[model samples]
Target: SVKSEYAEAAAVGQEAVAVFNTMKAAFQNGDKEAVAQYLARLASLYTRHEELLNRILEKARREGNKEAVTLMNEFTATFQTGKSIFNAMVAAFKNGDDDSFESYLQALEKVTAKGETLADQIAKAL
Candidate 1:
């Protein structure tokens, strides 16, 4: 019973921690390219967290945890928008489009605030 209660929260924590571990490992490898790739994936963790949230949200809804469901639903929407903006920012960086990159960066910052608030709610729900 206790394990079931904690599993989703632990999974969420582990998903974020895995990205940190990967970055740490990449640094230890002494390869610049590996470090760069890991850094990109670290940024990607923000986007990927939404997918994990979906599972937790579904379970919460099934269990009738209304607050968790509401928080996660809002977070998911914001996460999706932020992910789109971040993808465009990355593309702009690769293409050397400074204007587009900056625009996307600003948009991402605004959307991400909502996600952070939702994340705090989700954490509290757990």
Candidate 2:
């Protein structure tokens, strides 16, 4: 029973973590160009969803309630700054022989932290 339980747990964990691990490895192994291209495609989807995001922002600004506003800001904190992060990552990744994971991670952390900061700002505004 314990064996099966552990197997199931591992399976679920893999289902979730495998995607990220794959990305991390790809970049680690010098697939930065490929990763950047994939990120570009993702950027397009975000752009296409602009209208819905605007609606969410508008609605939250007007009547999202404090809880909803906090949630929206939290969401945007992660949602924005894709371009800068992705571009930095791409640049970091472009050099196959000397790519720095630390550099890329730093860039990502900056954007994420900035996102959290912006979210807090929006939350205060609401």
Candidate 3:
């Protein structure tokens, strides 16, 4: 089950990237409903990685791979930021706080950039 879960997490990670792109497009197209749906799904999908991350953290520490440990932590940091941003954005939308909604949208752009940066770092480690 651990192996399967890790495999599924990898697949989900790929899917999460695609879904994130779609969510961005939906927001750009002024489809608030679709954006909400995508955000909700993304928030839900984000939780699926907790176990995988924990496992990787354990392995990285046990192996004493500093690069791996740092990269993995950054990897989780990206997800944590993303999950919080999306959830807050959704709540802002629901409350009709246009100011906060837009604020979070801009914040999400920054988070996405960090996510890409972290991804690049992780790849370089690999």
Candidate 2 to truth, TM: 0.46
**TM-score, one value per model:** 0.63, 0.46, 0.70
Model 3 CA deviation exceeding 4 Å by range: 1-11, 123-126
Model 3, total clashes: 0
Span of ten consecutive residues with least summed lDDT in model 1: 1-10
Report each candidate's C-alpha RMSD, comma-separated, in the order given: 5.7, 10.3, 3.5
Cα lDDT for residue 51, model 3?
65
Error of 3 at 13 (Å): 3.5
C-alpha lDDT score of every prediction, in listed order: 0.63, 0.51, 0.73
lDDT (10s digit) by residue, model 3, range 76-121: 8777787788778889878878688778878977876767766555
Q: On a 0 to 100 scale, what is the lDDT of residue 32 in model 3? A: 85
Give lDDT tens digits, candidate 1, residues 7-93. 554465456557545644554555546645754875667655665666667777788888767877776777678678867866775
> Evaluated with TM-score, which candidate comes out highest?
3
Top lDDT: which candidate number? 3
| Ranking, lDDT, top scorer first | 3, 1, 2
User: 11, model 2: CA deviation in Å?
Assistant: 20
User: Model 3 Cα displacement at 94 (Å)?
Assistant: 1.8
Clashing pairs in model 2, backbone N/Cα/C closer than 3 A: none
